[PDB]
Design an enzyme around this catalytic site. Structure first.
Site, short mmCIF file in Angstrom:
data_model
loop_
_atom_site.label_atom_id
_atom_site.label_comp_id
_atom_site.label_asym_id
_atom_site.label_seq_id
_atom_site.Cartn_x
_atom_site.Cartn_y
_atom_site.Cartn_z
N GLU A 168 0.98 -1.13 -0.20
CA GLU A 168 0.01 -0.05 0.04
C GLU A 168 0.72 1.25 0.06
O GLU A 168 0.49 2.17 0.99
CB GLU A 168 -0.94 -0.03 1.21
N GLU A 309 -5.47 -7.77 -1.55
CA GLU A 309 -6.26 -7.65 -0.36
C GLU A 309 -7.61 -6.95 -0.86
O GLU A 309 -7.52 -6.23 -1.64
CB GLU A 309 -5.71 -6.46 0.60
O1 LIG Z 1 -1.62 -5.12 9.57
C1 LIG Z 1 -2.54 -5.23 10.85
C2 LIG Z 1 -3.77 -4.35 11.04
O2 LIG Z 1 -4.38 -4.49 9.58
C3 LIG Z 1 -5.67 -3.80 9.41
O3 LIG Z 1 -6.16 -3.94 8.28
C4 LIG Z 1 -5.58 -3.31 7.27
C5 LIG Z 1 -4.25 -3.67 6.47
O4 LIG Z 1 -3.19 -3.73 7.25
C6 LIG Z 1 -4.02 -2.55 5.48
O5 LIG Z 1 -3.35 -3.45 4.30
C7 LIG Z 1 -5.25 -1.95 4.65
O6 LIG Z 1 -5.22 -0.59 5.01
C8 LIG Z 1 -6.36 0.29 4.68
C9 LIG Z 1 -6.36 1.41 5.94
O7 LIG Z 1 -6.61 0.57 7.11
C10 LIG Z 1 -7.14 2.43 5.80
O8 LIG Z 1 -7.07 3.28 6.59
C11 LIG Z 1 -7.10 3.17 4.03
O9 LIG Z 1 -8.02 4.44 4.03
C12 LIG Z 1 -7.82 5.05 2.98
C13 LIG Z 1 -8.39 4.84 1.66
O10 LIG Z 1 -7.38 3.76 1.03
C14 LIG Z 1 -8.24 6.19 0.81
O11 LIG Z 1 -9.05 6.01 -0.49
C15 LIG Z 1 -9.04 7.29 1.44
O12 LIG Z 1 -8.75 8.80 0.87
O13 LIG Z 1 -8.36 7.54 2.76
C16 LIG Z 1 -8.48 6.23 3.59
C17 LIG Z 1 -8.12 6.83 5.05
O14 LIG Z 1 -7.95 8.21 5.07
O15 LIG Z 1 -7.26 2.37 3.05
C18 LIG Z 1 -6.22 1.26 3.34
C19 LIG Z 1 -6.56 0.21 2.19
O16 LIG Z 1 -6.41 0.96 1.05
O17 LIG Z 1 -6.56 -2.49 4.85
C20 LIG Z 1 -6.80 -3.36 6.24
C21 LIG Z 1 -7.97 -2.94 6.50
O18 LIG Z 1 -7.79 -1.43 6.87
C22 LIG Z 1 -6.46 -4.17 10.59
O19 LIG Z 1 -7.57 -3.04 10.55
C23 LIG Z 1 -5.97 -3.77 11.93
O20 LIG Z 1 -6.83 -4.34 13.07
C24 LIG Z 1 -4.48 -4.77 11.91
O21 LIG Z 1 -4.17 -4.58 13.23
#
Ligand SMILES: OC[C@H]1O[C@@H](O[C@H]2[C@H](O)[C@@H](O)[C@H](O[C@H]3[C@H](O)[C@@H](O)[C@H](O[C@H]4[C@H](O)[C@@H](O)[C@H](O)O[C@@H]4CO)O[C@@H]3CO)O[C@@H]2CO)[C@H](O)[C@@H](O)[C@@H]1O
Length: 377
Positions: A168, A309
């Site tokens: 990411e 993912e």
């Molecule tokens: O690794 C342990 C941990 O994982 C968490 O799950 C995450 C994944 O690790 C990660 O690969 C992926 O991340 C998300 C991220 O959490 C979001 O915050 C982010 O949001 C962005 C979005 O992509 C944009 O288009 C928008 O403009 O902004 C937002 C935030 O401002 O998106 C990414 C994915 O692209 O996904 C998993 C799900 O979040 C677990 O949640 C956590 O519990 C674990 O500890």
């Protein structure tokens, strides 16, 4: 050619496995899950407080999955990192092992089970995903050297298919600043400090020197360059690791028999994207959004595309629109032959998505799984 006797390659948009000893070569499918934890403060896959690690593998296999993407952080692949959160009474064979010896043991057994492993450098530190493949005190050279040591060691395990170079790539500011301000990733900017397309080529080449038999998986960024992103109406609304709009004009320069594009894509449980509003035509508007962000890479350009993912709570404690989202996404994958993927996550302890397991770490969400298993038939 290969230290294990197995060699992976991409022909067309399909991944093949070659056995140099028997001479067998067959297409493979990656029906995968993410088992995370080596990237967090645990320094180990989660759930070993509740489950035996071999038994977790056997359960994944029994549900039809044949591939695990294993997120790691830099500290977990260094000798001597002590894991937290293992019930040694359930995992006696893990007593006194460091996180690396545990990763070795898990991948070896996966192999015995015929499970492919994709190594994912998920975080540089152990707390969050950085927008770039380097930070203030950790350089791209340290990143690359970490991948070289990983490839040297894990290249010996037949079932390790390759390297997902950095999880990411993304931004921490808004466009237009995000393109030039050096705080986040880009693509097709012509700036080596930030261009993920260029970084991928440098990191992939280093790895292919030591593990020529591996595939290289390369994710999207969030923003690319202003001409690419403004050329589509939802060009500013891709996920982290989700924007592959720049591949047509700026393809990554690695061998075509080695390179796999690996976008991420999520639902309303992760972020309330504006195209999730029914006034925008959700969900019938999604196929075109997916196609523009990443799907054309395969459908128009002919590259292997593996979704690395995707997931969500599928209405269990989350947005009820997640059910419709996950159904529609799997419909589109099936009809467009996106057959290789890694679901996020096997673990239930993903705070915004849940997982395939429920919170007891033992039983599965049947409905969520039933929707996903359409890809495995
Ligand atoms: O690794 C342990 C941990 O994982 C968490 O799950 C995450 C994944 O690790 C990660 O690969 C992926 O991340 C998300 C991220 O959490 C979001 O915050 C982010 O949001 C962005 C979005 O992509 C944009 O288009 C928008 O403009 O902004 C937002 C935030 O401002 O998106 C990414 C994915 O692209 O996904 C998993 C799900 O979040 C677990 O949640 C956590 O519990 C674990 O500890």
């Amino acid at each position: 050619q290969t230290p294990t006797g197995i060699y992976y390659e991409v022909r067309g948009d399909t991944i093949y496995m070659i056995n140099v000893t028997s001479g067998e070569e067959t297409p493979i499918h990656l029906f995968g899950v993410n088992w995370f934890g080596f990237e967090t403060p645990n320094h180990v896959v989660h759930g070993l407080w509740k489950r035996n690690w071999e038994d977790m593998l056997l359960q994944i296999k029994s549900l039809g999955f044949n591939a695990i993407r294993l997120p790691f952080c830099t500290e977990s692949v260094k000798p001597g990192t002590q894991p937290i959160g293992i019930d040694y009474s359930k995992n006696p064979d893990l007593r006194g092992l460091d996180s690396l010896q545990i990763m070795e043991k898990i991948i070896k057994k996966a192999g015995d089970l015929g499970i492919f492993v994709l190594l994912d450098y998920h975080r540089i530190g152990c707390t969050h995903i950085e927008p770039l493949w380097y930070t203030e005190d950790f350089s791209e050279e340290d990143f690359i050297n970490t991948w070289i040591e990983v490839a040297k060691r894990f290249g010996k395990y037949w079932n390790v298919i390759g390297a997902d170079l950095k999880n990411e790539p993304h931004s921490v500011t808004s466009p237009p600043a995000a393109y030039t301000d050096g705080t986040g990733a880009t693509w097709g900017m012509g700036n080596p400090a930030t261009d993920w397309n260029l970084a991928a080529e440098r990191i992939g080449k280093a790895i292919l020197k030591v593990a020529p038999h591996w595939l290289i998986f390369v994710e999207g960024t969030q923003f690319t360059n202003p001409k690419t992103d403004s050329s589509y109406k939802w060009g500013y609304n891709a996920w982290w690791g989700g924007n592959l709009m720049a591949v047509k004009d700026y393809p990554v320069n690695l061998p075509r028999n080695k390179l796999v594009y690996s976008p991420h894509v999520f639902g309303p449980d992760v972020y309330n994207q504006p195209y999730f509003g029914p006034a925008k035509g959700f969900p019938d508007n999604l196929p075109d959004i997916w196609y523009h962000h990443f799907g054309y890479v395969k459908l128009e350009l002919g590259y292997s595309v593996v979704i690395g993912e995707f997931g969500g709570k599928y209405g269990h404690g989350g947005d009820p629109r997640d059910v419709i989202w996950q159904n529609k996404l799997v419909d589109w994958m099936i009809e467009n032959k996106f057959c290789d993927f890694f679901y996020w996550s096997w673990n239930p302890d993903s705070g915004d998505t849940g997982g395939i397991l429920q919170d007891d770490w033992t039983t599965i969400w049947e409905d969520k799984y039933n929707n996903l298993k359409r890809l495995m038939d």
